[PDB]
């Protein structure tokens, strides 16, 4: 893989519970991809052009904790399964890929970069199958072209018997 990545955790349970309730986050933000958490689910947000983008089925209609109190979505689209919040300052905003590549790389919550073959506007197959459980918590993660620009945001795993053979994603066009 020609894009590399690594994570850094910023909080644990107590902080997370507490920051959810109050909605106030004073942590320094950094990175292209935020790891997120509410009570009942884990997922990712991808910062593109100034906005942090993730799945509706994860964030629902909720605010995001931020430095001055909770941040309201500026984009909420139930059918495309997409929501957006103004990125807090610190987030490294990526750029929408337009080149048209067909070799894509999915960035997971554990900071693997894995190869995807684009098959349609919003589908790609895994060149190597993975367990669905290894993809859990990566919804919202970016699909990337080789130049590192974003084509889409990860949404669903298409699987049989616990193994993920393909992915459904929300094309950057939508964003």
């Amino acid at each position: 893989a020609p894009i590399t990545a690594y994570s850094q955790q910023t909080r644990g349970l107590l902080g997370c519970i507490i920051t959810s309730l109050t909605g106030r986050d004073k942590n320094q933000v950094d990175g292209e991809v935020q790891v997120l958490s509410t009570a009942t689910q884990s997922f990712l947000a991808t910062c593109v052009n100034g906005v942090c983008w993730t799945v509706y089925h994860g964030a629902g209609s909720k605010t995001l904790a931020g430095p001055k109190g909770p941040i309201t979505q500026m984009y909420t689209n139930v059918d495309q399964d997409l929501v957006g919040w103004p990125a807090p300052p610190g987030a490294r905003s990526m750029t929408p890929c337009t080149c048209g590549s067909s070799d894509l790389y999915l960035v997971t919550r554990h900071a693997d970069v894995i190869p995807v073959r684009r098959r349609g506007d919003s589908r790609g197959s895994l060149l190597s199958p993975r367990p669905v459980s290894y993809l859990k918590g990566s919804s919202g993660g970016p699909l990337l072209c080789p130049s590192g620009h974003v084509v889409g945001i990860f949404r669903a795993a298409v699987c049989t018997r616990g193994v993920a053979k393909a992915v459904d994603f929300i094309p950057v066009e939508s964003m």
């Binding site: 990545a5 910023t10 309730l21 991809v33 958490s37 509410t38 995001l64 993660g141």
Partner: peptide, 12 residues
Amino acid sequence: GSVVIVGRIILS
């Protein structure tokens, strides 16, 4: 109940 950033992935 707000969504909370619990960590981050730095890309390269």
